Amino acid sequence: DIAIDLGTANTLIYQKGKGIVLNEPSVVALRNVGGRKVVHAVGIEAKQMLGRTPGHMEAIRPMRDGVIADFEVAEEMIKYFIRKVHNPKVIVCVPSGATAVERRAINDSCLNAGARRVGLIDEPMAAAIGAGLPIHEPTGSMVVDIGGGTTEVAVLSLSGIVYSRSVRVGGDKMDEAIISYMRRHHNLLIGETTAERIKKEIGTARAPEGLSIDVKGRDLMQGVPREVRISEKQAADALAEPVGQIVEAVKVALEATPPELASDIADKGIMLTGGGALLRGLDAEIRDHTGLPVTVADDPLSCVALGCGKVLEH
Ligand SMILES: Nc1ncnc2c1ncn2[C@@H]1O[C@H](COP(=O)(O)OP(=O)(O)NP(=O)(O)O)[C@@H](O)[C@H]1O
Ligand SMILES: [Mg+2]
């Protein structure tokens, strides 16, 4: 009786008639204890451990690039979360491009985690539903859902997918571009938590030098902590490659769209969902390159889960 948005960054569970009852980082901490590995923390508590664990301890993200990588740890993650909210029927989101291998792994791990039955829903369909798009109508709707692992672009109509594609670019690749930028341009080593803070605070899809923030890491030359100031322009330059990928995926989708649906999209524009939809200026950038209106869904982190939930209610 539940819907699971199983994401690289965040897992949400919608329960029938209750709405979203769990919203937690997709993180599992394991603790070494006599050669054996026990689950130590899952969720919010484990996320705060990333880049900060002592020797006996490991913080893991078992979902990468939109799909299950480490199946044993993902199963423990799903079990933990399903237990926390309580045999149910489950529907789970999956990237539209997920291969047959990747889909069977979600299915098996949910079955292994407790599910009686499992249905898979394509992420951009869920995202569109949850962002309030009229996906059941004979009209073209286009959604772009930018997560931590993948960016999903789709055109939907009549309760189905007209076009869809998953590209392996999103928030994680953005963080990695920022880490690489700090190393190459400032000879400073920063971690994933600092990179994500940069991205959220001054990260943007188009150069303005603009605002700035101070971050800390390890100075590579001196081997001591050092504080560096980074500007919106530098963050813009670091993010230019992944942002350009997302934009090209949108253009590719538009070229594949049947002309009457293209006509519909010209009116309605494009809807952005997912945590990556909050990247400053991403809406304007897509607008510039396509000619179309671009709207950011309200609370885009939760569109997929609300979409899966509405399916549960019908
Ligand atoms: N304000 C922000 N600006 C830029 N990026 C953001 C912002 N807020 C969150 N993010 C990113 O959004 C991502 C999380 O979004 P989310 O939609 O939950 O992805 P997901 O479902 O967990 N991953 P996926 O499996 O690829 O769909 C992370 O990479 C965040 O860093
Ligand atoms: Mg997602």
Author numbering: 12 to 97, 104 to 225, 229 to 334
Cite, word for word, the article reporting this structure.
In non-spherical bacteria, the actin homologue MreB is essential for shape maintenance as depletion of MreB through genetic knockouts or MreB-targeted drug treatment results in misshapen cells that eventually lyse. The MreB fibres are attached to the cell membrane via a hydrophobic loop in Thermotoga maritima as well as Gram+ bacteria and via an additional N-terminal amphipathic helix in Gram− bacteria. Here, we demonstrate that MreB from Caulobacter crescentus forms pairs of antiparallel protofilaments as revealed by crystal structures, an architecture unprecedented among actin-like proteins. The crystal structure of Caulobacter MreB (ΔCcMreBdh) reveals the typical actin fold, containing two domains on either side of a nucleotide binding cleft (Kabsch and Holmes, 1995).
In contrast, the crystals of Caulobacter MreB contain doublets that, remarkably, crystallised in an antiparallel arrangement. Upon polymerisation, domain IB shows a rotation of 21.7° towards the nucleotide binding cleft as analysed by Dyndom (Hayward and Lee, 2002). This domain closure is accompanied by a twist between domains IA and IIA, as can be appreciated from the top view in Figure 6—figure supplement 2D and from the schematic in Figure 6C. The interdomain cleft narrows due to the movement of domain I towards domain II that is accompanied by a rotation of domain I resulting in flattening of the interfilament interface. The relatively small conformational change upon polymerisation has a dramatic effect on the chemistry of the active site. In the AMPPNP protofilament conformation, the active site residues E140 and T167 coordinate a water molecule that is in line for the hydrophilic attack on the gamma phosphate. The catalytic site residues E140 and T167 coordinate the attacking water to be in line with the gamma phosphate in filamentous MreB (pink). In both proteins, the active site geometry in the filament conformation favours nucleotide hydrolysis, which is driven by a catalytic glutamate (E140 in CcMreB and E148 in ParM) that positions the catalytic water in line with the gamma phosphate. From the ΔCcMreBdh co-crystal structures with ADP and AMPPNP, it is clear that the active site could well accommodate a guanidine instead of an adenine as the major contacts are with the ribose and phosphate moieties of the nucleotide, a feature, again, shared with ParM.
